[PDB]
Amino acid sequence: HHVGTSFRGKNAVVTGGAGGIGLQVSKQLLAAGAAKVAIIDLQDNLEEFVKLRAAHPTQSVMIIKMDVANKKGVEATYEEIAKTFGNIDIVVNVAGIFNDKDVQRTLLVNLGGIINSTLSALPYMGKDNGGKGGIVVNMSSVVGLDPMFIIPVYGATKAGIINFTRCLANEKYYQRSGIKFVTVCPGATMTDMFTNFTEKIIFPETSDETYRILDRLNKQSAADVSRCILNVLEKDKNGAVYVIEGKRVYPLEIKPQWTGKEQA
Amino acid sequence: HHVGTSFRGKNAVVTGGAGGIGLQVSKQLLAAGAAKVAIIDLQDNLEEFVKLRAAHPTQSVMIIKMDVANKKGVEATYEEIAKTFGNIDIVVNVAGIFNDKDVQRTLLVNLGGIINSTLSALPYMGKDNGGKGGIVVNMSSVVGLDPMFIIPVYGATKAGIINFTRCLANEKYYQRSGIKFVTVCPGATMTDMFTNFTEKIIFPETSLNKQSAADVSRCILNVLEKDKNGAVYVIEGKRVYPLEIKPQWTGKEQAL
Numbered sequence A: 001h002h003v004g005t006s007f008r009g010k011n012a013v014v015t016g017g018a019g020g021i022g023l024q025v026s027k028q029l030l031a032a033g034a035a036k037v038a039i040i041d042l043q044d045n046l047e048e049f050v051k052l053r054a055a056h057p058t059q060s061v062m063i064i065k066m067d068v069a070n071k072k073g074v075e076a077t078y079e080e081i082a083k084t085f086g087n088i089d090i091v092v093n094v095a096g097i098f099n100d101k102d103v104q105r106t107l108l109v110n111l112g113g114i115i116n117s118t119l120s121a122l123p124y125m126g127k128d129n130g131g132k133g134g135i136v137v138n139m140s141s142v143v144g145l146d147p148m149f150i151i152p153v154y155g156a157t158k159a160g161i162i163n164f165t166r167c168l169a170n171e172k173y174y175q176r177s178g179i180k181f182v183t184v185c186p187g188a189t190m191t192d193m194f195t196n197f198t199e200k201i202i203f204p205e206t207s208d209e210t211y212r213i214l215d216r217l218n219k220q221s222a223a224d225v226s227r228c229i230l231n232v233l234e235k236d237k238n239g240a241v242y243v244i245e246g247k248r249v250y251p252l253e254i255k256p257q258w259t260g261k262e263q264a
Numbered sequence B: 001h002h003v004g005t006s007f008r009g010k011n012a013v014v015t016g017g018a019g020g021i022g023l024q025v026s027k028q029l030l031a032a033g034a035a036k037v038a039i040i041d042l043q044d045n046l047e048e049f050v051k052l053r054a055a056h057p058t059q060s061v062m063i064i065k066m067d068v069a070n071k072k073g074v075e076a077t078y079e080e081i082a083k084t085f086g087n088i089d090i091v092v093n094v095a096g097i098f099n100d101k102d103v104q105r106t107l108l109v110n111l112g113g114i115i116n117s118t119l120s121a122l123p124y125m126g127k128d129n130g131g132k133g134g135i136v137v138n139m140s141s142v143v144g145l146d147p148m149f150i151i152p153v154y155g156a157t158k159a160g161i162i163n164f165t166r167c168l169a170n171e172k173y174y175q176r177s178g179i180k181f182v183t184v185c186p187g188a189t190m191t192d193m194f195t196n197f198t199e200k201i202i203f204p205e206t207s208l209n210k211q212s213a214a215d216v217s218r219c220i221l222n223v224l225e226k227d228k229n230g231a232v233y234v235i236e237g238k239r240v241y242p243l244e245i246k247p248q249w250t251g252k253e254q255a256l
């Protein structure tokens, strides 16, 4: 029941917020007393959202059905959100999928959706456009940092997310816009995304060693990761990259790869 | 005129081979005496290819017009190439673009095309499928390794290429297939791709000669001869630098 003060007065947009981690992120932000929370997702979860609005009468809970791969849709969706909200302090882009069999869809949803949502959010967040400034947390994976041979396509999009998000963490941009950019990379997690795993992988003969990804998923839940995300949000460290494993948050010091130390 | 022996008896597929680095890669492989070379590109470049076939009468020079973003097209394209070639020893996936204003196209061409071409090539290369085995060199960027703030979208796809290519470099994959997988990351390069740069960037208010396509191409063939699985090379100033890619996630990280 109790609504808190941790995120009092904060307006927040959450892609993927109908299920899994995104749904918990939305709940926990409302529970922390976020003034307004918008949710962008493909699936309709009316029974969950009716309860959610009920439990948070003095808070805005806005739900939009939209494919984050849809560039113009996302743009449109943000326009509508902005007119009601007036400002966007927090964006957590959680929406993604796991399907190696469908390469095009993976790229456009996982990498494309992050990009679409991020670029779309910026005008309504940036100081130069009258915004207060804010933070964008982009969701990635551990396999984004360290490749996992079983899932090359899914991995690629996660490596792309990291590199993309770090770019925007430029000092010159921050001084102009006031927006910060953070990447979080969850490890073994109880996600429904990895259900029917071996039906969603390219090389079928890797089912023998598929234990690596799905053995210790119980280690952390969606709610655990969500708590880690809100923890990260409070840190407000620009350009930071976090790993979330075993219910815990680990910051990475990412050293440059090409420094010229190569010999010949 | 002279045709060499460095790549004698080798069959090679090259995406992006109508222009820039790809075109030079195609020439240099033929000049090194590659038995067969196939080229996959959107542009026709007929006057260059008529000259090329002439200069290599005892070598196969096959040209197909095809969008590497087109999954089924690429698949189709490889079947015909395979029918003539019989096997594929070398794939260099060079085809790519620079357009940040168009995000979807960038992802599907740059990252998608690499994936499409790579996955399509594997049956015709893999030992277990009757193939001789081989090597796939995938083209990336330095910004793929170290993010460049001016070009975030283009960068993302290059980071994606690296991570993708490294995955396939698994030892279990190699003993089963015999195919190796290499990533090369060119630096400051005289590419026509970066012409009209500021018309192709997202943030408009924001403010290499050392190496050419032919220089990078020479570096690629150098890398090809090395035949080191899982390797990542930087190509800067006409020179090849191997990277020691250390894991990002260690247990030394302190929980905050």
Ligand SMILES: NC(=O)c1ccc[n+]([C@@H]2O[C@H](COP(=O)([O-])OP(=O)(O)OC[C@H]3O[C@@H](n4cnc5c(N)ncnc54)[C@H](O)[C@@H]3O)[C@@H](O)[C@H]2O)c1
Binding pocket: A015, A016, A017, A018, A019, A020, A021, A022, A040, A041, A042, A043, A066, A067, A068, A069, A094, A095, A096, A097, A109, A113, A139, A140, A141, A142, A143, A186, A187, A188, A189, A190, A191, A192, A193, A222
């Ligand atoms: N080990 C890992 O790599 C790992 C583990 C867990 C989570 N993650 C990351 O966490 C993120 C969330 O995953 P999850 O645990 O919540 O699983 P999940 O499948 O339960 O969450 C997916 C949510 O996103 C929605 N969605 C999917 N595609 C969409 C689209 N195009 N447009 C709008 N909404 C869309 C879905 O409707 C769903 O609600 C994932 O994207 C993943 O990158 C990675």
Ligand SMILES: NC(=O)c1ccc[n+]([C@@H]2O[C@H](COP(=O)([O-])OP(=O)(O)OC[C@H]3O[C@@H](n4cnc5c(N)ncnc54)[C@H](O)[C@@H]3O)[C@@H](O)[C@H]2O)c1
Binding pocket: B015, B016, B017, B018, B019, B020, B021, B022, B040, B041, B042, B043, B066, B067, B068, B069, B094, B095, B096, B097, B109, B113, B139, B140, B141, B142, B143, B186, B187, B188, B189, B190, B191, B192, B193, B213
């Ligand atoms: N610093 C850097 O990031 C950097 C520098 C140089 C080169 N590169 C990379 O080298 C590669 C080649 O670029 P370049 O220097 O030769 O420039 P280029 O534009 O001259 O070559 C691109 C070639 O790919 C073809 N192509 C484009 N889209 C295609 C598609 N969908 N399907 C088939 N063919 C397509 C084009 O017809 C062209 O011939 C690129 O992948 C580029 O990312 C990166």
